[PDB]
Amino acid sequence: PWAMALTPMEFARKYNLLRKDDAPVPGEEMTAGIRRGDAKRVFTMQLGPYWDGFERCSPQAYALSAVFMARMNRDRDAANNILKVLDKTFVDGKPDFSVARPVMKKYQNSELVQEVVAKHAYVLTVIASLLEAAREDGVVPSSEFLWLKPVDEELWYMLNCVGRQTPYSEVAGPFAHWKAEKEMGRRSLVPMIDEAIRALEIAVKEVRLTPRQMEELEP
Amino acid sequence: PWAMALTPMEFARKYNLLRKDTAGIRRGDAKRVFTMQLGPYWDGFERCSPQAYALSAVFMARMNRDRDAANNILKVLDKTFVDGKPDFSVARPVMKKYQNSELVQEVVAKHAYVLTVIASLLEAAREDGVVPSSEFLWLKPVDEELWYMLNCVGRQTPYSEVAGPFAHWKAEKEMGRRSLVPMIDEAIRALEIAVKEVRLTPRQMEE
């Protein structure tokens, strides 16, 4: 009934990322490896599309981006109006994302928004940075857009990773990318997801397998 | 012995773009040729060509009122072109110092392509006065697209060899944002118009 976040080992099996070994490393006896190539592909697909104007985003990403721009520019009423109109209209059927249009139009070219957009190359890494910035004005909890979880899972988990230390595996690639753009000091179109692969490798090494489980791995 | 910039008709011929309507233009193929002119996306100055890197740094130096750093780059590139191969690395210290300067960050934010970024660097450099091509003549043999693109900045109309990126450059400015989707339709329109103006040489072969 309730969508549960996957653990590292569940994520790895679901995407067929577990590998036998070849070459004997101490402390790591009955343990699986990671298919690096495959893991890269999967984390790269998590990254999603390039930012290329707010109007090419999904309505969700566009609507929520508007809310965070509103907060960045100290306009709580505009932010709150959106969130309220989306709640009203979620009771009966589909959220009315179009209410975000005046706000986006008003703030997308504002100075704080431009600064964020210039730092990030992907829809997900921009909107993540918009949330972070919006939180310098107040709380902006995920509870205010609870409807997003059923709707768009990746966006939900990326937004809930903002301000945490460790990501959900579902969004480990865009999380890794986001912090790499922050460390490099620039937007990066080339994926920078090595951290998500190391974290995965490390978390897999924590799990002893049985003989039968080991037999099941392929090379 | 001298590279002459192609006319819009010679350009059309070189790339098999003339058809029966007045000639007409093959729209699909022209779109493909203007898109190829756009070149690679910007994704850090370290991925640029050596010449694009060095000349971006000169322009960053100037934007940041630093004529002596711009002049040393150009001076070195000149002296090492007497001999043989330019030593483009002389601009590593300037790049490093200026790439995150505020003025450079405003420019880089507005443009998604190497050629549209550098084009706005040159334009910004000119807020500090004259930045003529005369000070990098070595480029014309080395890299004609870059050469012609920097000589079109400030001008009403581009050479056809760089009309894609020039078009995309003005589109980005008009949209107010960088655009990864190419916006080269105006290069197609200008090439259509310039072909129509020339009168057909009757007895032609065409498709």
From Swiss-Prot, chain A:
Subcellular localization is given as: Cell inner membrane
Q: Which GO terms describe its biological process?
A: protein transport
Per the UniProt entry, the effect of R56E is: Results in a significant decrease in replication in macrophages. Displays lower levels of effector translocation
Effect upon mutating T44R: Abolishes intracellular growth in A.castellanii
Any one annotated GO CC term:
plasma membrane
User: Topology versus the membrane, per the UniProt entry?
Assistant: Multi-pass membrane protein
| Superkingdom of origin organism | Bacteria
Q: Tell me which UniProt keywords the record has, alphabetically.
A: Cell inner membrane, Cell membrane, Membrane, Protein transport, Transmembrane, Transmembrane helix, Transport, Virulence
Major localization listed first in the record, in broad terms: membrane
How this chain assembles, per its entry, is: The T4BSS is a complex nanomachine composed of several subcomplexes. This subunit is part of the Type IV Coupling Complex (T4CC), a subcomplex composed of the DotLMNYZ core and the IcmSW-LvgA adapter subunits, linked by the C-terminal tail of DotL. Six DotLMNYZ hetero-pentameric units may assemble into a hexameric nanomachine, forming an inner membrane channel for effectors to pass through. Interacts directly with DotL.
Q: What does this protein do?
A: Component of the Dot/Icm type IVB secretion system (T4BSS), which is used to inject bacterial effector proteins into eukaryotic host cells. Part of a subcomplex which recruits effector proteins and delivers them to the core transmembrane subcomplex. Forms the interacting surface for recruitment of acidic Glu-rich motif-containing effectors.
Q: What is known of its domains?
A: Exhibits patches of positively charged residues, which form binding sites for acidic Glu-rich peptides.
Protein's recorded name: Type 4 apparatus protein DotM
Report which part of the complete sequence is shown: 158 to 380 of 380
